[PDB]
């Protein structure tokens, strides 16, 4: 039988790191997605995401939603992308584009959002 859930979600977007691989810098963000503000009785999860991924995210939320206007992630066409203000910008804006989507009626129970917020968690 079935527990009942409110289905909300509590999102937070920090610690904005570097990703160093073999053949590409980018940057990260780490994304701790909580069920509810108790101790017990939830999900927890935390990830990490660099743009790219949040840009996934929002075309398979559109093509499932066409009707929409999913909200947006503006980016403008070597040193930028890893200045200060330029993170922290993003920073801010990612926050505010997974709360919208969180809070939203239909796009919060989207199966790719569910994936984007849990596939490789960390501990």
């Given at each position: 039988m079935d527990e009942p859930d409110l289905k909300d979600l509590f999102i937070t977007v920090d610690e904005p790191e570097s990703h160093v691989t073999t053949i590409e810098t980018f940057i990260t963000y780490r994304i701790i997605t909580k069920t509810?503000?108790?101790?017990?009785?939830s999900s927890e999860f935390e990830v990490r995401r660099r743009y790219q991924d949040f840009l996934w995210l929002k075309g398979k939320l559109e093509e499932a939603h066409p009707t929409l206007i999913i909200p947006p992630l503006p980016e403008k066409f070597m040193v930028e992308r890893f200045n200060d203000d330029f993170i922290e910008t993003r920073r801010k804006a990612l926050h505010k584009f997974l709360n919208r989507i969180a809070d939203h009626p239909t796009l919060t129970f989207n199966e790719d959002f569910k994936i984007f917020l849990t596939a490789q968690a960390w501990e």
């Open positions: 509810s503000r108790g101790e017990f009785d």
